[PDB]
Amino acid sequence: PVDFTGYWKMLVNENFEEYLRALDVNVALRKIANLLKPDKEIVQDGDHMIIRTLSTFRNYIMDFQVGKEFEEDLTGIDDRKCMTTVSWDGDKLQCVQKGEKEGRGWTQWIEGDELHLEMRVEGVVCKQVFKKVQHHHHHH
Ligand SMILES: CC1=C(/C=C/C(C)=C/C=C/C(C)=C/CN)C(C)(C)CCC1
């Protein structure tokens, strides 16, 4: 069965600038963010999912139950609040983020040693791929 648990290092990050612009992330933060190559530390614990998006400058932490709508605090990205639901779709994890922006959400899946993440908002698509890695680093 699909299990996202692991430590994952960014390999590619496609169209991130336009995704951030569509979120109205401020220009100075977009400049910082485009230099970053975040890791993902994921623990899948039953249907309790923790996805830590870790970078040298700032983190974004998700901690939620699959299937259950929750208030998602996007402080550090666009500082918005969404009413967010993450659901299994076969071997894919689907996320809908209800809020100010239309069409906001993402899909996550695994191909071999790769974690694939398609992020969407306002018809814009950013695609990230990470490689599963084994050398760990301490974090908060
Ligand atoms: C814009 C910005 C950032 C953007 C983070 C983003 C979009 C995280 C998306 C997380 C998702 C869908 C995770 C599901 N694997 C960092 C990495 C927190 C650094 C500070 C500035």
Side-chain angles (χ1 to χ4, degrees), residues 1-67 69-140:
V2 181
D3 191 331
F4 294 105
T5 299
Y7 200 88
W8 306 87
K9 185 163 186 172
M10 179 167 277
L11 188 75
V12 295
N13 187 8
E14 177 175 35
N15 205 34
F16 192 49
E17 165 69 10
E18 285 302 308
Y19 174 83
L20 296 183
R21 194 167 64 82
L23 296 180
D24 310 302
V25 173
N26 74 76
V27 56
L29 184 53
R30 295 204 311 268
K31 183 181 173 193
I32 296 165
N34 277 287
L35 299 174
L36 301 176
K37 293 174 284 195
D39 297 335
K40 304 269 181 180
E41 182 187 272
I42 301 176
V43 182
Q44 179 177 318
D45 188 11
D47 270 348
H48 176 198
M49 192 75 71
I50 297 166
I51 304 173
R52 302 176 175 107
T53 302
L54 302 171
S55 86
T56 56
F57 179 71
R58 184 183 297 169
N59 304 332
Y60 177 63
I61 309 304
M62 297 190 79
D63 185 338
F64 58 86
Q65 192 75 7
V66 180
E69 184 176 80
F70 60 98
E71 182 173 309
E72 186 186 9
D73 175 357
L74 291 141
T75 293
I77 301 175
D78 63 328
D79 304 320
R80 289 199 180 89
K81 174 197 300 208
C82 289
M83 300 304 296
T84 296
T85 305
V86 180
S87 306
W88 286 106
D89 170 21
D91 291 348
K92 302 188 293 217
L93 197 65
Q94 300 286 5
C95 177
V96 177
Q97 293 171 291
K98 295 193 231 154
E100 170 59 21
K101 298 299 178 181
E102 301 288 348
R104 191 181 183 158
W106 49 258
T107 306
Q108 188 174 271
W109 70 99
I110 286 171
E111 302 184 16
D113 69 1
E114 295 167 357
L115 180 72
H116 286 251
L117 179 62
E118 181 182 276
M119 297 190 295
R120 295 176 297 269
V121 66
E122 295 284 345
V124 177
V125 180
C126 164
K127 178 65 191 298
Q128 300 181 339
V129 186
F130 305 76
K131 286 280 177 176
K132 206 174 190 290
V133 291
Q134 312 301 331
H135 188 75
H136 195 236
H137 193 293
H138 184 247
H139 53 81
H140 187 71

